[PDB]
């Protein structure tokens, strides 16, 4: 029992992290087969970051201006190219530790594990969600760029995030592994702001189910609301609107608990309007929105009476 | 910036997890050099768990009763001995992925990473604190026993916890890697209760320093206190005592932010006596006590 924000074991991704130097800048890269992926702003100097012309910066480079290290093993760079906001370095050696992998672009509300790295070395792992404003509420310092987010299904690693920068409100932005940014952000050291961040309603509901399964049930109401009725309250408290597809996703959690989904919505409604009266839910004083319904299912398996 | 429960990367520990089976009982083992460490209840049926005589149960086993499986390769057990509540199985192959390691017994309030495993196969990793009542609040299902807790210091894995069992409140109980339980618990199926938990005061202060480092500045007040006066309020609010040794541990964070340790004691005293008045600290409406001072510097400094 118990219920924790849990990250995937990071060993497979650790086997892919390398150090990428260009000029005087070191950050992290991802070594898959014979390609190293990393943020293109590794070619900037500290003078270049207000409005870099990345094409112009890159034609000034050659393979000799990149140093890639996989641990103490040197990787000879034999090609480079720029795809959107990621640099792809071709190297003379395919990574023998390459897992089965995919590149996927996740939707807001979906979670993933982050392996934070500095100078090519894994430093920590933790669980994150793509927020509705396309930021990540992470923990990153200077030198973390090129850290990646991922999920593991079976033995296949789905890479979904590569980290580029920190917005001044203390949240983080980055790209998929094809280099397309999540959200309206660009890789420059300019003034940009996260949009208003809303709460992921479906995930809050899944977390409440997790609380019920683990015995925390003080907040339930035998009351049924409607989708339209709930959504009026949702917009008042800056919650993502709830769709019928959200209700479908929560069907299995609903069967295991014997609490219908619109009952749980009425329970969540009452928490929004009245607060939690000084009690906690799963050790938390806030409504938690970074567990997906699948994340809850993996961690709270139960017998079904038939 | 940002502050998050952050575990150490699990790769070096994943290379040590094996599956240990004795009869119809399977749990997790830690393979280091030519030894596998696992909870001794691997040698029990459902019936034995009521009141096991572990010595008599073990002396009835042989090497061949023990199935150790590392991935797709089985290892031969070539000796077995019991150390307190853990079993040490000698295996005929030294783990080529053995990291530099040490075994440490940790104190309440310290944190560690847990690599939850089922059937010898890693499932997930997360941070835990050793509570003052010597339990942890983890996420362990049946079959997770033998999962281990660890810190990584440079190239070295300090193993400090191995999981054994679940208590009636859903908290978890375990041993160090010498098989000595944390807390008054025993590896038998009888009613045992976690003691009254207390808030790890020095960790709360460390978390407040982490807030200020991130920019959450509002709880500060230039009112101050003595250590003896602060603890009087601490006692009443079920907070652990704050020792001079705790004040020393916070010294490095004190000089980073510029806030004297007892000044942050005075601010937390105000937080306890009034509540937070609807605000949050580091995106929490509660005073978080599961980040040590070392955990904070790990996340805010170079």
Residue numbers in the entry:
A (entry chain A): 1 to 306
B (entry chain C): 1 to 302
Paste lines from the article:
The main protease of SARS-CoV-2 (Mpro, also referred to as 3-chymotrypsin-like protease or 3CLpro) is responsible for the majority of nsp processing, cleaving at 11 conserved sites along the polyprotein including self-excision of Mpro by autolytic cleavage of its own N-terminal and C-terminal autoprocessing sites. SARS-CoV-2 Mpro is a functional homodimer of two symmetrically disposed protomers that are each 306 residues in length (33.8 kDa). The active site of Mpro features a Cys145-His41 catalytic dyad, which orchestrates nucleophilic attack at the carbonyl carbon of the invariant P1 glutamine and the formation of an acyl enzyme intermediate central to efficient peptide cleavage. Using C-terminally substituted Mpro chimeras, we have determined X-ray crystallographic structures of Mpro in complex with 10 of its 11 viral cleavage sites, bound at full occupancy intermolecularly in trans, within the active site of either the native enzyme and/or a catalytic mutant (C145A).
Cleavage site C8 has crystallized with the same approximate unit cell dimensions and relative Mpro dimer orientation in the crystal lattice as that of the earlier structure for C5; however, the C8 crystallographic data is defined by the space group P212121 with four protomer molecules in the asymmetric unit (ASU) compared to space group C2 and two molecules for C5. Primarily small beta-branched residues, threonine or valine, are observed at P3, with C8, C9 and C10 having extended side chains with significant aliphatic character (lysine, arginine or methionine).
